[PDB]
Design a protein around this nucleic acid. Structure first.
Ligand SMILES: Nc1ncnc2c1ncn2[C@@H]1O[C@H](COP(=O)(O)OP(=O)(O)OP(O)(O)=S)[C@@H](O)[C@H]1O
Ligand SMILES: Nc1ncnc2c1ncn2[C@@H]1O[C@H](COP(=O)(O)OP(=O)(O)OP(O)(O)=S)[C@@H](O)[C@H]1O
Ligand SMILES: Nc1ncnc2c1ncn2[C@@H]1O[C@H](COP(=O)(O)OP(=O)(O)OP(O)(O)=S)[C@@H](O)[C@H]1O
Ligand SMILES: [Mg+2]
Ligand SMILES: [Mg+2]
Ligand SMILES: [Mg+2]
Lengths: 329, 492, 318, 257, 258
DNA sequence: CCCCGGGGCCCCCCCGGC
DNA sequence: TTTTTTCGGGGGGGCCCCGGGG
């Protein structure tokens, strides 16, 4: 723990205040208004990984309190035991007792509550309801089916959407300015495309790209660096593979696939995913073609997930695509 | 001091005389006969029998569905014939330690209250052990101690329970008189309900009692509570409002394995008309009534029905084949569920794969009786034989080069010819050769028997061994015991 | 700001039995019991957010009054309710002597009784019968099948029903009047639609809408609150063309942040309650959805698997 | 604090009296009349009955106008009593229709006053009229010897048979470790009259009791100094231990013939 | 062994200090300066705060070049500290940028030397000044009497209410079996000045506290003969036990009353 | 120096969906 | 017309043994 410069970019660039959280305008505005007027309800932040839930709640707590929020809030996560005994004793005493340092209300943050047992969630119901006058609860979740209906009904739900492109571009610009780096527009587009709405992925990939460059001062991060560090297929490669599979004989398609994969050690799963994305735009004249494509490609993906014979898997991909498109005549 | 207007109707209009109890007259009379002649059995040392065979059992085991008058009947019989009641309920700790230091020290002691209150049995004790099934204890609950008391009690010990056919109460199999109380019929309860109706100033037409009783599954207490609640605002109970009351107060009891299997394998719940009354939710919930026995019962009883839901051109064989395929899929799902990952969220899917879907293809009318699962006993037998084979294999590991499967499939057929055939063909003279062969492989007599118990098909040795002359077997055993034999595993 | 204000769900919690909307028969009967007495042992069952606990508390208060402190024993899931608790504390409370008005009794409120072990419930049988002249028992549960039948036979069944649109609208309008909220009828309709009959959710959504943007209209209401995803899944599974179903899965579920596990579980539930489709087709769809769920639970969770599941469902429905 | 105002001269007396029969019964009925306090309690086994009388003489100051019955749980009473001080003044206070009693621990050396309240339990147990019984045999022997004999016999058997005849008392315990008999006879010694053993028998009798009940009975022997055993044909033995003003009697029922 | 070298009068002293609050908090953080050792620990429930302020005069010798922070686990510290005799001398040794703290046990009479090193834990503590509020009331009473009162009232109920009024201290506890109240007044004595109840009051106050925390705040009664309780309305309550050199303070948050 | 209260482990027994 | 597998959590019974009191 020397300084912040010796930290991963995912942690080095954690939003400190609520103004540094991007892509969640509605939720941020609503929670800030609640803190302003003092109408904070029991909150349930539901969202996919790396969207700004933990950061948002920590920033909210630091905004309500000062820099001593660590001692004025009860934050429990999956790394800590949260059984029925914990809910009955520790959470109950925290909710029913005044603040040692300040003279304000109390906040309990049950992060990763989806990992809690049903008994603990059931016990939390009346604990939440009874001490509502001086206590408020915040629950952060990724999957909603693991939360009991009673807990869901007792909390106001806020959904963290996948981060749009615009917020990702702004945060990438901020990181580039801070790190003194240059990013090509096509490199930026590839980074946002591979992000899948996750900022942690963007930060990790950007750190890897900075590492790849010989001298990060003058050199620029081109899409080539993106694909080299991520080891992902190139759009031209995917298009060429699809063209060879759909318009050439078996020998030519096999040779093209093998050459493309061996050029940079491209993985079969990435090629399958890219081809699926490409075919999504295709306007098929027969529903059977799309049905067969989806089913057979899903089966191939499931087989790949458990390993097996890679060459046979690639041949199966080629054959499935050809057979499915044979129904377009 | 307690105003009657503030008392519950169940306790207010409660039975006061043993005759007031409705239905189950035979059970009440049988209990009275058993308890009245208890002293006579004591004089006979409980050795002689009686007309009804009640003179040998030293304890009573009243049982029946809930809310029928079991505890009331027991207390009324204890108070009528004349006795002092020492009742123990689930609210009191009935563990083995407490039982030894509790009721045990009173089974053969006089009644201080009985004497200081004032009948030869008036000062005697009647211990009523109510809610036996409610004792939550397998090794520290003292159920076996209760059985011991029933076996060695100096006073009439009456046990009351709601469900006799449970493993927990197997110790009370044949150490007590099994008195059965059944659901009382509407005919006897109509008089009581009409009396309460006249007393409490609300209308109840004669045609409504049967339906109200069917609503509560013959629970007189529940019917009285129904009347008390409905009389709060609606003082008229006529045919115009039976449907709403019965639908709001319908009892929902969980069906038992046999009933679940019978209901599930019916072609009326799978019809386009019956599917609306009995929806998929109902079937999935019925699976969860007993989620450990339902799939086994379905797999055991899906081949003994005449179907009525077969598609045009489909035969019974194809339907059973499809059901078996889905049963195999459900078995795979079950293997996934009960694994290191602990995937219980898949339980609903299992319900569809193992129980609902396979039944929906062979649903119809039973062509026999619902048989209990045969896989449990077969699994126990397989485990026993596997342990025996393991013992035999590790007894011979120093003279053989194979595994247990290879030993079972390859070596044992030849070992039989070297161990049993000589007795059949030669006789007693072959004892020495068999002893030698068993000595070469560190084989014991019990190992010999276990080996002879493995063969199947035309090689079954039960009749062949039972036919061997007794002299040869006796000489074999005596010669083996008189000789010193080696040891393979020297357990220190 | 470090001084919060009470939420409307608590600030406007009904304190009398006449302020509870919905289940007119049961509420009127409870009012009659409160005015007369002789409260029977009762079990109140129903879905979340309907007013079971509120009704129980209002009845107990109106029945006892100044004796509420010494004549009510409230135990919930947050409090230990094991066999020892039942056999000692509840027994002592039942045996405790309290001089109450002529037609009043002590009350034991076992909230969330469905989370009690079978042993505790069995130990709770005779205490209700030998002390019925001094104490009465009220249970509030969501699932009524978790209470052992012997106890159910000892209590009056009160199965609360799902609240209708009229009751929610009435209560919401009353709260709006008491808080002077600017609203549009479309906003109230949207709030009711998204509440799904849960009064707590309706009030919370209304409060959030007012405190975030002011006017309660359809746009503002839907900006915070999203439409129930089960209905979206139902629409996706009932589409005619596979293209439309895939579009619904894509632009309405996948990109909104909904996880694949949630989508598959919701699809399973909806197909289980899809009365429109025949039972056999529903069973095959359930088989396919279960295959997809098993695939996802092993770590292979991707839009491709959901698309394949939809394609198989469409093939089955063709 | 109007109806019942009682003040023990020493608080330790109440603690000792309660502890004497604390392990015998669970719940008790203290009926406070104008003449004193009388309590009757039956154990869970419904075989041992306990009577207790405290008179005005033991009380430094007693004032009770109307008779009041107080149902108490001995565990809670012991808890509250242990919370007091031995060298303290204990005062029992009961008011109109008492739903609870007040125990006041008050001392004069210091000005610390501790006012505890104990909630009363609605005990539904009719008073079993203890009709006077002319027991056939009356045996009085020092509590020390009784305790010694019963404790020695406790390890022998779970049941002890007592036979009384001419200047002869036999205690026989036949259990799992063998059979042991203890024989005692009356004696009068001027050196230690308090330890003298006195027997008054008209017809010899023999009755078998349970060892555990006798042990629990003697557990309270520290209160008194001698035993007042009375035995009849088919009646419970009256183990009477006399205190300053009043008494504490056990009515241990016999075993079946 | 350069920065910190501190030898105690006897290991029993540090043992007693540790046992006074090892059942209340789990992770502690000492901040050793040239003036002594000060530690602040917060309970998991965030309801009880323990503050220890051992002084320089409690050591035979105490050397500390620079202020050094040590984060430690109380279970492990107590376990290691239980590996010594009651007649030995214990010295704490800490080096540059400490990664572990060395506990050396020495017995000159028996010429016995024992070593024990405990790895320190990275706790980013923010040691908070104990701002001395203008407490509404303060009092001093023998620790044994307070222990007796709390232990008696704990059985009745799980909460204890302290009311401070005009020369009157009321310890009340309402539970299930019944209620209890103990009233004590300021008593001044000259024959045995060690025992006395002193009260300095400005405004009357009434505060409820949990029995579980009070039962652990009294385990420090073995550390002193008198205890000082300072109470302020809707403010943390201070329970101070004065050591031979320093003091041990428990800050307890009054329970909410709604 | 010996007995009793009550904290702390150890062992076992049963559930698991909406 | 009768009776099985595994982790993890929770509950409930059983001692064990330190501490404190007498
Ligand atoms: N809205 C955001 N704005 C800026 N950075 C973000 C944002 N969301 C995520 N990040 C970045 O990703 C990192 C992780 O953010 P978090 O919100 O803490 O992750 P998370 O949402 O809690 O993950 P889950 O849902 O528990 S798997 C942050 O430190 C940021 O660097
Ligand atoms: N045959 C009956 N006739 C009249 N009332 C009955 C009858 N059976 C039950 N009841 C009524 O229901 C009340 C309770 O009956 P109980 O005998 O206590 O129940 P039970 O038969 O022992 O079953 P469980 O094990 O208690 S659920 C009685 O006081 C009666 O008021
Ligand atoms: N019938 C109702 N009338 C008015 N308000 C209601 C009603 N039902 C619920 N509410 C409101 O929602 C709040 C919570 O109601 P609850 O009584 O907690 O619902 P509940 O059914 O007990 O929840 P569960 O089943 O324990 S999860 C109340 O304070 C009311 O403000
Ligand atoms: Mg997080
Ligand atoms: Mg019964
Ligand atoms: Mg509720």
């Amino acid at each position: 723990k020397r300084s912040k410069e010796n930290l991963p970019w995912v942690e080095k660039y954690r939003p400190e205040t609520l103004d540094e959280v991007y892509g969640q305008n509605e939720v941020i505005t609503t929670v800030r208004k609640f803190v302003d007027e003092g109408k904070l309800p029991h909150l349930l932040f539901y969202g996919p990984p790396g969207t700004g839930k933990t950061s948002t709640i920590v920033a909210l707590a630091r905004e309500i309190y000062g820099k001593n929020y660590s001692n004025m809030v009860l934050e429990l996560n999956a790394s800590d035991d949260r059984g029925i005994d914990v809910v009955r004793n520790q959470i109950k005493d925290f909710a029913s007792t005044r603040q040692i340092f300040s003279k304000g209300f109390k906040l309990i943050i049950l992060d990763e509550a989806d990992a809690m047992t049903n008994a603990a969630q059931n016990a939390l119901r009346r604990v939440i309801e009874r001490y509502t006058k001086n206590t408020r609860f915040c629950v952060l979740a990724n999957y909603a089916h693991k939360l009991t209906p009673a807990l869901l009904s007792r909390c106001t739900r806020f959904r963290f959407q996948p981060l749009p492109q615009e917020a990702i571009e702004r945060r990438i610009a901020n990181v580039l300015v801070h790190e003194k780096l240059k990013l090509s527009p096509n490199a930026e587009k590839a980074l946002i495309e591979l992000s899948n709405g996750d900022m942690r992925r963007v930060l990790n990939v950007l750190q890897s790209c900075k590492a790849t460059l010989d001298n990060p001062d003058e050199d620029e991060i081109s899409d080539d660096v993106i694909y080299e560090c991520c080891g992902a297929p190139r759009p031209s490669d995917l298009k060429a593979v699809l063209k060879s599979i759909l318009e050439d004989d078996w020998g030519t398609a096999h040779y093209t696939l093998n050459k493309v994969r061996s050029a940079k050690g491209l993985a079969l799963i990435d090629l399958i995913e890219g081809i699926v994305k490409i075919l999504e735009d295709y306007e098929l004249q027969n529903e059977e073609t799309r049905v067969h494509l989806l089913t057979k490609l899903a089966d191939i993906e499931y087989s790949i997930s458990k390993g097996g014979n890679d060459q046979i898997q690639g041949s199966a991909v080629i054959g499935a695509i050809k057979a499915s498109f044979e129904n377009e005549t | 001091v307690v105003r009657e207007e503030d008392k519950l109707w169940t306790v207010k209009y409660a039975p006061t005389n043993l005759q007031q109890v409705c239905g189950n007259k035979g059970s009440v009379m049988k209990l009275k006969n058993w308890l009245a002649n208890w002293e006579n059995s004591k004089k006979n040392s409980f050795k002689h029998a009686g007309k009804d065979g009640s003179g040998v059992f030293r304890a009573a085991m009243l049982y029946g569905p809930p809310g029928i008058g079991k505890t009331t009947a027991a207390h009324l019989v204890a108070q009528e014939l004349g006795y002092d009641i020492l009742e123990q309920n689930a609210s009191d700790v009935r563990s083995k330690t407490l039982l030894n230091a509790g009721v045990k020290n009173a089974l053969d002691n006089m009644s201080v209250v009985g004497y200081f209150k004032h009948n030869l049995n008036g000062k005697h004790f009647v211990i009523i052990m109510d809610e036996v099934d409610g004792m939550s204890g397998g090794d520290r609950g003292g159920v076996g101690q209760l059985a011991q008391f029933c076996r060695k009690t100096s006073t009439p010990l009456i046990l009351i329970c709601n469900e006799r056919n449970l493993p927990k109460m197997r110790p009370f199999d044949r150490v007590c008189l099994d008195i059965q109380f059944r659901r009382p019929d509407a005919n006897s309860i109509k008089s009581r309900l009409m009396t309460i109706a006249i007393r409490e100033k609300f209308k109840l037409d004669p045609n409504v009692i049967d339906r109200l009783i069917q609503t509560t599954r013959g629970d007189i207490r529940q019917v009285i509570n129904l009347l008390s609640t409905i009389s709060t605002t609606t003082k008229t109970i006529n045919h115009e409002n039976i449907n709403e009351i019965s639908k709001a107060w319908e009892k929902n009891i969980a069906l038992k394995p046999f009933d679940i299997a019978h209901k599930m394998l019916d072609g009326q719940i799978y019809s386009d008309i019956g599917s609306r009354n009995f929806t998929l939710n109902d079937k999935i919930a019925l699976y969860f009534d007993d989620f450990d026995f339902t799939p086994l019962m379905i797999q055991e009883n899906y081949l003994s029905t005449r179907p009525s839901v077969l598609k045009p051109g489909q035969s019974h064989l194809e339907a059973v084949a499809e059901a078996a395929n889905c049963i195999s899929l459900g078995d795979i799902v079950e293997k996934k569920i009960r694994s290191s990952e602990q995937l219980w969220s898949l339980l609903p899917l299992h319900a569809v794969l193992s129980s609902v879907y396979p039944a929906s293809k062979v649903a119809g009318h039973m062509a026999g009786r619902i048989n209990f699962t045969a896989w449990l006993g077969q699994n126990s037998k397989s485990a026993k034989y596997y342990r025996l084979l393991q013992e035999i294999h590790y007894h011979t590991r120093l003279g053989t080069s194979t595994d247990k499967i290879g030993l079972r499939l390859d070596y044992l057929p030849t070992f039989r010819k070297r161990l049993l055939d000589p007795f059949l063909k030669q006789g007693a003279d072959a004892i020495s050769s068999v002893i030698e062969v068993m000595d070469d492989y560190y084989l014991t007599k019990e190992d010999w028997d276990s080996i002879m118990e493995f063969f199947v098909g035309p090689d079954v040795t039960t009749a062949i061994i039972k036919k061997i002359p007794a002299t040869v077997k006796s000489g074999f055993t005596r010669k083996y015991n008189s000789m010193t034999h080696p040891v393979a595993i020297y357990r220190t | 700001t470090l001084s919060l204000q009470l939420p409307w769900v608590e600030k406007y919690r009904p304190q009398v039995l006449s302020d509870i909307v919905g289940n007119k028969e049961t509420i009127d009967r409870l009012q009659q019991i409160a005015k007369d007495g002789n409260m029977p042992h009762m079990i109140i069952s129903g879905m979340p957010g309907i007013g079971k606990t509120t009704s129980v508390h209002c009845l107990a208060h109106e029945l006892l009054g100044r004796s509420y402190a010494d004549g009510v024993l409230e135990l919930n899931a947050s409090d230990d309710r094991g066999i020892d608790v039942v056999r000692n504390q509840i027994k002592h409370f039942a045996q405790k002597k309290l001089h109450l008005p002529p037609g009043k009794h002590k009350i034991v409120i076992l909230d969330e009784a469905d989370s009690m072990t079978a042993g505790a419930q069995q130990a709770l049988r005779r205490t209700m019968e030998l002390y019925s002249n001094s104490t009465r028992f009220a249970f509030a549960c969501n699932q009524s099948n978790k209470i052992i039948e012997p106890l159910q036979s000892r209590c009056a069944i009160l199965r609360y029903s799902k609240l209708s649109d009229e009751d929610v609208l009435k209560r919401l309008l009353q709260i709006i009047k008491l808080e002077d909220v600017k609203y549009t009828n479309d906003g109230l309709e949207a709030i009711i639609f998204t509440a799904e009959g849960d009064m707590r959710q309706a009030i919370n959504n209304l409060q959030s809408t007012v405190a975030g943007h002011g006017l309660v209209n359809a746009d503002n209401v839907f900006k915070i609150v999203d439409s129930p995803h089960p209905l979206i899944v139902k629409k996706m599974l009932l589409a005619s063309n596979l293209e439309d179903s895939i579009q619904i899965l894509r632009t309405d579920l996948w990109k909104k942040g909904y996880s694949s596990i949630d989508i598959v579980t919701t699809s399973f539930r909806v197909t289980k309650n899809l009365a429109q489709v025949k039972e056999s087709v529903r069973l095959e769809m359930i088989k396919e959805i279960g295959l997809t769920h098993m695939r996802i639970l092993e770590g292979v969770g991707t839009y491709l698997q959901l698309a394949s599941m939809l394609a198989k469902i469409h093939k089955l429905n063709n | 604090a109007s109806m019942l105002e009682a003040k023990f001269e020493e608080a330790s007396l109440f603690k000792r009296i309660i502890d004497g029969f604390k392990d015998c019964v669970q719940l008790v009925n203290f009926q406070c009349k104008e003449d004193g306090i009388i309590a009757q309690a039956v154990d869970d086994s419904r075989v041992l009955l306990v009577s207790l009388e405290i008179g005005v003489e033991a009380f430094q100051e007693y004032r009770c106008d109307h008779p009041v019955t107080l149902g108490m749980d001995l565990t809670s009473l012991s808890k509250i009593l242990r919370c007091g001080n031995n060298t303290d003044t204990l005062t029992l206070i009961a008011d109109n229709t008492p739903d609870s009693i007040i125990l006041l621990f008050e001392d004069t050396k210091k000005d610390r006053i501790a006012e505890y309240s104990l909630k009363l339990m609605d005990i539904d147990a009719d008073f079993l009229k203890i009709e006077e019984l002319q027991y056939d045999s009356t045996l009085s022997l020092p509590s020390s010897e009784f305790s010694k004999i019963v404790r020695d016999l406790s390890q022998l058997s779970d049941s002890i048979n007592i036979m009384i005849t001419k200047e002869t008392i036999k205690f026989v315990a036949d259990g799992d470790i063998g059979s042991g008999s203890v024989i005692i006879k009356p004696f009068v010694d001027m050196e230690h009259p308090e330890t003298s053993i006195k027997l008054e028998m008209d017809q010899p009798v023999d009755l078998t009791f349970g060892a555990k009940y006798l042990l629990d009975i003697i557990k309270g022997s520290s209160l008194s100094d001698r035993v007042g055993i009375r035995l009849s044909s088919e009646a419970p033995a009256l183990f009477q231990f006399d205190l300053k003003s009043g008494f504490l009697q056990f009515f241990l029922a016999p075993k079946f013939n």
